[PDB]
Ligand binder design. Structure first.
Ligand SMILES: *Cc1cc2c(cc1C)nc1c(=O)[nH]c(=O)nc-1n2C[C@H](O)[C@H](O)[C@H](O)COP(=O)(O)OP(=O)(O)OCC1O[C@@H](n2cnc3c(N)ncnc32)[C@H](O)[C@@H]1O
Ligand SMILES: *Cc1cc2c(cc1C)nc1c(=O)[nH]c(=O)nc-1n2C[C@H](O)[C@H](O)[C@H](O)COP(=O)(O)OP(=O)(O)OC[C@H]1O[C@@H](n2cnc3c(N)ncnc32)[C@H](O)[C@@H]1O
Ligand SMILES: OC[C@H]1O[C@@H](O)[C@H](F)[C@@H](O)[C@@H]1O
Ligand SMILES: OC[C@H]1O[C@@H](O)[C@H](F)[C@@H](O)[C@@H]1O
Ligand SMILES: OC[C@H]1O[C@@H](O)[C@H](F)[C@@H](O)[C@@H]1O
Lengths: 577, 574, 52, 104
C-alpha cells in the first residue's frame, strides 16, 4: 500500500470495475478499496452462480443472495412476546436492540433495502438483466439536441453491453421460453413487442450459463502481471473507506481516509482523482460522513453548505410479483406436432413427428427435444425436457405500459406445498414501476446512531408519491394479473402482491445527476463530477435522476464510461516508474 | 499422468491424508467434485469474513445454500386451489428431483451433502471433542491402557492439525455467566468446560475458525514455500468409480469426469484414498461393484463388503433456545454500586477492584461498568461486543449425550427478533445410536442423482431399546438443565430435529478388526479388506454409537491410516 | 370453534404491526392510531392478553 | 394426551384491573385495562419449576407432539382470574371488598 496513486476507487462492484477497466487500461496507477472480501473463487468478483453445483441445484442459490443482503434500516421492534417464562428477563419497553434504528419511522421506510459487502458487490449475485432505458426513463446527456442525445446514449450503452457481455440469445432454444414468448407475442400482436430479457451472460453449453459480473468487466487481478506487464492496479479488500477530506475552499479532495479492518489501523490515502462507487446508500453515507449535505434529521431551517440535494429526490421502484403454473392448453401445445401411439411404458409406445412439415407449429429443434424426452421418460406426464432452460421474456417499458417486465425464472425458495408442483410449469412474473423523484423522499444519516462499521446509520424517509407513481403502480399490478392469466393461473403461495419496499434493490438519485446544481436539484454533472470539486466523481444508480422502471445498472454503467472519458482528458497518468 | 496417491474429496479428512502424505514426500493428486469457493485461502471457513462476524445470523444462509438433501421422498401434498386452466397431473408423479425409492417414514430427511472445496468444513461449527471410551472404537484389543495411549497420541496430533483449544471464549461474560451457574448447579455430579473448538481468536471481535485449509492449504506444489513437495488439486471433477482387478485384491485406476471440459479419464496411482463423505464414499464404492446396488435383497448377498451401507448410525438431536433468567442478568452487575438514574449528568456505576466481596473479576466488572455508563439508554448489563457462550458437559455414563450450550448462526423468526440476543442461548443435546444391521444406506439401480450416480436411499429408524430410551431421557435432561439458565424462547421450544439434520452420520463403511466377526468394511488402518491399496477416510469409518461431534475422531483414524501407507508404499522420486 | 366464538378479548392493545406491502393507491396510515376496538390505555407488555 | 399444569399467583397490590374514563367498550361501558405481571419471587420460581415438572412427567407417557411443544400460554388464556373484588375478614387489614358473606 503506497502513499499515493493516480486514482483511488472506493468499491469493487460493477461500477467501480468500469472505472478500473477504463482507467487501468489507459495507463493510470489505480487503487481500489473494498470494505468486503474476496469470496467467489479464483475469478475475483465473479458471479457466485457460475458453479456447476448451483446450476444443478438452482434454487439453492436463493440462500447465497439472502446471505449477503444486510438490511439498511430496521425499525425498532414492537412485536409483543408474552409467553416468556415468568423467570426469564423480560423488557419493560421496546428498547433499541439487535441493531435496530430508533431514527426509523417503520411506516416511511424502504424496509427491503439491503446492502452487500463482498468483492464484486451485488454483481456476484445479481440476475444479469441489462435493458436500455428509452428516452422517457433516461437522463439527458445533451440538452436541446435529441438526435445527439440519442447518439451519445447509443454509443455508451453499446460499450457497456460489451463490458457486460449483454446479449438477447442465450435462451433462444428454450422450449418454455419460446412457449411463453410466442403465446404473449400472439396475444398482444399489434399492441406490444416481446423479446428475450437482455442478459449479461455467455452460454457455454446447454446446461450452463456463465453469468457476467464485475469480474467480466475487470478481472480484479493485481497489475503489473504477465498478461498486462505495463498496467498498475491494486485491490485492497477489507478496507472500510470512511471519509474523503475536503480542502477549506470546497474545491478539491485532499486525501481518502481508510480503516484496514484486518490490522485495525486507520490510514489516509492520496490520489489525483477520487472515485466513489460504494453503491447508492454507501456513496451518500461516505459523502455525508465527509461534510456534504447535512448530517442528522433533515432540517429545512438549516440548509447545508454543500450539495443540499444529497440524499433527497431518491427513487425506488414498485415491484409486483407472482408465479404461474402453466396452462393445460399450453402444455398440450408443446406436443401438438407429435403423433402418439400406444400407452407410455408398454413396448409399443411410439412418439413421432415429421421434420420440416409445413403444418408443424414448432420448429424441428423443438420437436426433437420433445420426442426424445417423451420416449426416454415414459413415466413422466410432461412434454418439457428436464434440462430445458428457463424462460427469459419481457415486453419493455412503453408509454402505454410504463413498467419493466420480466417473465422468467429467478432463483426461488419453495414452500412445502409449492414443491408439490412440477417446477417445469412455474413462471415468475415481476413488473417494475418507475417512481417520480420528489424532494421529500430522503435517505439521511443519523448523527447519533452508527452502523456495524461505525458509520452514521442510514435512515429512509420514503413514500411512493401520490399521483402518476401510485396510479401506475396499481395499473401495473392489474396488467400483471391480466397478462399472466394468458400463460396460466396463479401458484398458491406466490399470489400477486407488491414486494416489501426496496427489496427490489433498484434505489436511484441519492446523489443524482444533472446539468446545473441548483436548477436541476442535483449533486453531480454529466461527467459525474461533484459540483465545485475538480477531482471527486461518483458512479452508481444514485446518479440516476429520472423515474425509471428498467433495471438500472447498465445505465449507471454507461454514465461511468462517460465519466471516465472526462477523467482521461483532464488528469494524466503518472510515469510508469 | 501417474500419481503416487490420489485422494477423492477436499474436506478435512482428505486434507489430513494430503498433509500427511504430501509432507512425507508422495506425489499426491486430490480431486473434488466441488469448486474453489472461500477466497484466496483454498478450502477455508466461509465465516472468516469481517462482514459475517459482524452479521453472524446471516451465516445460516451460507450453510443452507450448500446443504443439498440426500433423499427427498416423492411429494404428496395436495394443492387443490390451482386455477382450473392450470395444468395438473392426476398422480403424485416423480418430480422436482425426488427419490421414488425413498420410504418417507424410514428416512434421514435432514441428511445433506456439500460439494465445494473444503467440503462441510467451510461451514461447520468447529466443535472438536474427543470420544471417551464408551463411544470410541478399539484400536488395540485387550489392552485398554494401550488403546488409550494410541487414541491420545492420535487425538493430540488431530487437535494440532485443527487447532483445537478451550480458551477462545474465556473472557466472555455470557460464557462465564452460563459456565459458572451450571458448574454450581451440578457441583459434585457433572463437569462443565468450554466446548473444544477448532479455532484461533485474532481479536476481541474476530475468531479465525478452522477448516480443511487449516489442516492443509491446498496450494499446488511444489511452490516457493514447499519446493520439494508435490500436490495438485483438481476441482470440478466427479470421481465415479474405482476399478477392481479380476482378483479383487487391488484397485487399478480411478475413473473421473471433469465437469468443465466434459472429458472422462482413468487416473492411475499406487494408493487410492476415498474421503468423499459418509454418503458419497459409499456411493462411489457401490458404483464400483462393492456391496450391493439396488434395493437390498438378502437372498442375494454381495461378493464384496457385505456390510457396506449397513449398521449406519445417525444421532438423535434435541434443541431449544432459552431467554436468560432475571436472576442471572442482575448477577452480571452484582458488584456494581448504582448512583442516580441512567441518562442524567449524575448517574454513576462503580465497583472497587480486587474487593473480596466481589463476585466477578476486575476484567468483567470493568467491561460491565463501561457498557452501563456508555449506553445509559440500554437496559442490560452485558456489553454489545461480548462474545457468545460456548459451554459443554461432555458425554458420561450417567448422561450419555454430548451437549452444546452456546450460540450458532441462527435464522430468527422476527417475533423472536423482539428478544435481545444477549439473553438467548442455544441448547443442543446429541444422542448416541446403536449400530444395527437393518439400518441402511443403499443406492438405486434405476434412479440417479444430479451427477448421474446411483441415487442414495435411507432405510433407517432410531433403534428401539437404549437408543430410544436415551433419546427421550436426553430431551428431559435438556428441559431440566436449560431451566436453570432461563425459560424457553417462544418459537424455539424443546424439540427433536429432523432426522439427519445433525449431519453426524457414520458407520456407512465401518471399521473393525475382522470383516466377518465385526461386520465391517475397513480394518484399523482404514484399509478396505482384501485390497492392497484402497483406503477410506471419514465418519463412515466410525463403527460405534457416539454422541459427540465425530470429525476429530475421523481425523485421528485418518492419521493412523497414513502411518500404514507410509510404512507400505514408496514415494516416487522427485 | 364454539369456545373461540364466544371469547371476546377483554383488552387488546393498539396494534403496531407494519403492513408495508399495500398497493400505493390504497389508503395508508401515518401512525398506529386507535383502530378496530383496541384500548389505547393498555400497555401491551403488562397485559392479560388472553383474558376474554 | 394433553398436559396442562396451572400455577398459583401471589396476590400483589400493583397487579390491577382498572377502567378508562374516556375509552368505552362495545356496550358503552368503561374499557377494562390490565396492569399485570406475574410476581417475582415464589410465583415466578414455581412457574418455571412447574414447566420442568410437566416436561419430566409427560416424558413418562410419551414424547411431545410436534406443533404442541411445552410452552407457556398467553397470559390469561386460562380464564382463572380472581381477586378483583376479593373476600376478606376486614376491609383495611385484609385489603378487601366483601366479607365472608360476600357482602360489600
Ligand atoms: C441483489 C440483487 C441485485 C440485482 C439483481 C438481483 C439481486 C438479488 N439483479 C439485477 C439485474 O438483473 N439488473 C440490474 O441492473 N440490477 C440487478 N441488481 C442490482 C445490481 O447488483 C446493482 O445495481 C449493482 O451492483 C450496482 O453496482 P455498484 O454501483 O457497483 O454497487 P455495488 O453495491 O454492486 O458495489 C459497491 C460496493 O462497494 C462496497 N462498499 C460499500 N461501502 C464501502 C465503503 N465505505 N468502503 C469500501 N467499500 C465499500 C461493497 O462492499 C461493494 O462491493
Ligand atoms: C454442515 C455442518 C457440518 C458440521 C457442523 C455443522 C454444520 C451445519 N459442525 C460440526 C462440528 O461442530 N464438528 C463436528 O465434528 N462436525 C460438524 N459438522 C460435520 C463435519 O463438517 C463433517 O464431519 C466433516 O466435514 C466431514 O469431513 P470429510 O472430509 O470426511 O467430508 P466432507 O467435509 O463432506 O468433504 C468431503 C468432500 O468430497 C466431495 N465429493 C463428494 N463426492 C465426490 C465425488 N464423487 N468426487 C469428487 N469429490 C466428491 C465434496 O464436494 C467434499 O468437499
Ligand atoms: O427481486 C428483485 C430483483 O429481481 C430480478 O428479477 C431482477 F432482475 C432485479 O432487477 C431485481 O434486483
Ligand atoms: O446443526 C447440527 C450441527 O450443529 C452444531 O451445533 C454442532 F456443532 C454440529 O456437530 C452439528 O453438525
Ligand atoms: O384453556 C384453559 C382452560 O383449560 C382447561 O384445561 C381447564 F379445564 C380450565 O380450567 C381452563 O379454563
Amino acid at each position: 500500500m503506497d502513499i499515493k496513486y493516480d486514482v483511488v476507487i472506493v468499491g469493487s462492484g460493477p461500477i467501480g470495475c468500469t472505472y478500473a477497466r477504463e482507467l487501468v487500461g489507459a495507463g493510470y496507477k489505480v487503487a481500489m478499496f473494498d470494505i468486503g472480501e474476496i469470496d467467489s473463487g479464483l475469478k475475483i468478483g465473479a458471479h457466485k452462480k457460475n458453479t456447476v453445483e448451483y446450476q444443478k441445484n438452482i434454487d439453492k442459490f436463493v440462500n447465497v443472495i439472502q446471505g449477503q443482503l444486510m438490511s439498511v434500516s430496521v425499525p425498532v421492534n414492537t412485536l409483543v412476546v408474552d409467553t416468556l417464562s415468568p423467570t426469564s428477563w423480560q423488557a419493560s419497553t421496546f428498547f433499541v436492540r439487535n441493531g435496530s434504528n430508533p431514527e426509523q419511522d417503520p411506516l416511511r421506510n424502504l424496509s427491503g433495502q439491503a446492502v452487500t459487502r463482498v468483492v464484486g458487490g451485488m454483481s456476484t449475485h445479481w440476475t444479469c438483466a441489462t435493458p436500455r432505458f428509452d428516452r422517457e426513463q433516461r437522463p439527458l446527456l445533451v440538452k436541446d439536441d435529441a438526435d445527439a442525445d440519442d447518439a451519445e446514449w447509443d454509443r455508451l450503452y453499446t460499450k457497456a453491453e460489451s463490458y457486460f457481455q449483454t446479449g438477447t440469445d442465450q435462451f433462444k432454444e428454450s422450449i418454455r421460453h419460446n412457449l411463453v414468448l410466442n403465446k404473449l407475442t400472439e396475444e398482444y400482436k399489434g399492441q406490444r413487442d416481446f423479446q428475450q430479457i437482455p442478459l449479461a451472460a455467455t452460454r457455454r453449453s446447454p446446461t450452463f450459463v456463465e453469468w457476467s459480473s464485475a469480474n467480466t468487466v475487470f478481472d480484479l487481478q493485481n497489475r503489473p502481471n504477465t498478461d498486462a506487464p505495463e498496467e498498475r492496479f491494486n485491490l485492497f479488500p477489507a478496507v472500510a473507506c470512511e471519509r474523503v477530506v475536503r480542502n477549506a475552499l470546497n474545491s478539491e479532495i485532499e486525501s481518502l481516509h481508510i480503516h484496514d479492518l484486518i490490522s485495525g489501523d486507520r490510514f489516509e490515502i492520496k490520489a489525483d482523482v477520487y472515485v466513489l462507487t460504494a453503491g447508492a446508500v454507501h456513496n451518500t453515507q461516505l459523502l455525508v460522513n465527509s461534510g456534504f449535505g447535512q448530517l442528522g434529521r433533515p432540517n429545512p431551517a438549516n440548509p447545508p453548505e454543500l450539495l443540499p440535494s444529497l440524499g433527497s429526490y431518491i427513487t425506488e421502484q414498485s415491484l409486483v410479483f407472482c408465479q404461474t403454473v402453466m396452462s393445460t392448453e399450453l402444455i398440450d401445445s408443446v406436443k401438438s406436432d407429435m403423433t402418439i401411439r400406444g400407452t407410455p411404458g408398454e413396448l409399443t409406445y411410439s412418439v413421432t413427428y415429421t421434420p420440416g412439415a409445413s403444418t408443424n407449429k414448432h420448429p424441428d429443434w423443438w420437436n426433437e427435444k420433445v420426442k426424445n424426452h417423451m420416449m426416454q421418460h415414459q413415466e413422466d406426464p410432461l412434454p418439457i425436457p428436464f434440462e430445458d432452460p428457463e424462460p427469459q421474456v419481457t415486453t419493455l417499458f412503453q408509454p402505454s405500459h410504463p413498467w419493466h417486465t420480466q417473465i422468467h425464472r429467478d432463483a426461488f425458495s419453495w414452500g412445502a406445498v409449492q414443491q408439490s408442483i412440477d417446477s417445469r410449469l412455474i413462471v415468475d412474473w415481476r413488473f417494475f414501476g418507475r417512481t417520480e423523484p420528489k424532494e421529500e423522499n430522503k435517505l439521511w444519516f443519523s448523527d447519533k446512531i452508527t452502523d456495524a462499521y461505525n458509520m452514521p446509520q442510514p435512515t429512509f424517509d420514503f413514500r411512493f408519491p401520490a399521483g402518476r407513481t401510485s396510479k401506475e403502480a396499481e395499473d401495473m399490478m392489474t396488467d400483471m394479473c391480466v397478462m399472466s392469466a394468458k400463460i396460466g393461473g396463479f401458484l398458491p403461495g406466490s399470489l400477486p402482491q407488491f414486494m416489501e419496499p426496496g427489496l427490489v434493490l433498484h434505489l436511484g438519485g441519492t446523489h443524482r445527476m444533472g446539468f446545473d446544481e441548483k436548477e436541476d436539484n442535483c449533486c453531480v454533472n454529466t461527467d459525474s463530477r461533484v459540483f465545485g470539486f475538480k477531482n471527486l466523481f461518483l458512479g452508481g444508480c444514485g446518479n440516476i435522476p429520472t423515474a425509471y422502471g428498467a433495471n438500472p445498472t447498465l445505465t449507471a454503467m454507461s454514465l461511468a464510461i462517460k465519466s471516465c472519458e472526462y477523467i482521461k482528458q483532464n488528469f494524466t497518468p503518472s510515469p510508469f516508474t
